[PDB]
Amino acid sequence: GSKNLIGRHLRLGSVEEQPFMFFATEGCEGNDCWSGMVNDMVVKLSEDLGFTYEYIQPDDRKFGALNKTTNEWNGMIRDLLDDKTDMIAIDLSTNSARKSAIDYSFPFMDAGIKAVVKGEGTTLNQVLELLDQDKYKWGVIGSRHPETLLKTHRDSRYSRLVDEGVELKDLNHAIETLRGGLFVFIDEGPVLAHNLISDCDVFSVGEEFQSFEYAFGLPKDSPYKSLIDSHLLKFREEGFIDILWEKWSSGNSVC
């Protein structure tokens, strides 16, 4: 209520995930190393709400999931819980596991789970078909939202997909493995749409499934949630979110 963001210095959790965030590894310092749709959102928020900021990446370079053995979190989620950051500024997918530990902002993009495949010959119509064959290998990225959704799905055959697939390290590793062929990568619609635009030999496996949002992550009891929510709703209403997606997402297709 009384507390606002004017003069505050926010620590923002993020990682590279194109086209939401691009991180330059040389030739830059501080905030200048970052660009993309989410960066443009943060810049505008900072101008309108009067805060300064920096970005902090988790050492493990994970988005974050809950380990059922240890009952601990990792990734950006863990950094937020540990007060290393004040908000997670990325395409942070909404899931119930995360919601048990943190809050979300007002959301800015509907998304679904999408499976894609590279391979000549017989192909697949739905991901559970993977369990009854050995032509294709498959995987999800460890400690990221799709893995969490598949592992918590009430049809435990989706847990089988995770347990019996390859645990991919990160998006680059996953895309490199997909491009190697005879592989199904199960991830998120907007991320795959952008990043695989010029992969003319990569195709869909069925339709998208599951419904969720991208939002920012906030700690429970954050004094800044109401302001962030209001300003994100305004960005959506003014058309700013759509304008940024057009600016940053890939167009055409050599294919």
Question: According to CB under 8 A, which one of 172, 234, 250, 253 is a site residue for a second copy?
Answer: 234
Residue 237, binding choice from a second copy, Mg ion, none, Cβ under 5 to 8 Å by partner class: a second copy
Question: According to CB under 8 A, which one of 2, 70, 71, 100 is a site residue for a second copy?
Answer: 100
Closest approach of Cβ 44 to Mg ion, in Å?
A: 20
With CB under 8 A as the rule, give the number of residues binding a second copy.
29
Query: Which residue lies nearer to a second copy by CB, 199 or 213?
Result: 213
- Please list the alpha-helical segments (H only) found in the chain: 37-49, 75-81, 96-99, 145-152, 157-164, 171-179, 189-195, 225-238, 240-248
Residue 207, binding choice from a second copy, Mg ion, none, Cβ under 5 to 8 Å by partner class: none
202-204 and 137-141: which strand pairing? unpaired
Residue 236, binding choice from a second copy, Mg ion, none, Cβ under 5 to 8 Å by partner class: a second copy
Which pair of structure tokens corresponds to residue 244? Answer: 């940024």
Query: Would you count residue 167 as binding Mg ion (CB under 5 A)?
Result: no
Q: What is the distance between the alpha carbons of residues 233 and 209, in angstroms, rounded to a whole number?
A: 26
Q: Which of 39, 17, 187, 30 is nearest to 117 (CA)?
A: 187
User: 10 Å Cβ neighbour count for 64?
Assistant: 27
Query: Which residue lies nearer to a second copy by CB, 118 or 144?
Result: 144
Helix, strand, coil abundance in the chain, percent, nearest 5 = 35, 25, 40
- 129 exposure class (CB count in 10 Å sphere: 0-12, 13-18, 19+): middle
Query: Which residue lies nearer to Mg ion by CB, 179 or 236?
Result: 236
Query: Would you count residue 156 as binding a second copy (CB under 8 A)?
Result: no
Q: Which residues bind a second copy (CB under 8 A)?
A: 94-96, 99-100, 103-104, 106-107, 110, 149, 152, 154, 210-213, 220, 226, 229-230, 233-234, 236-239, 241-242
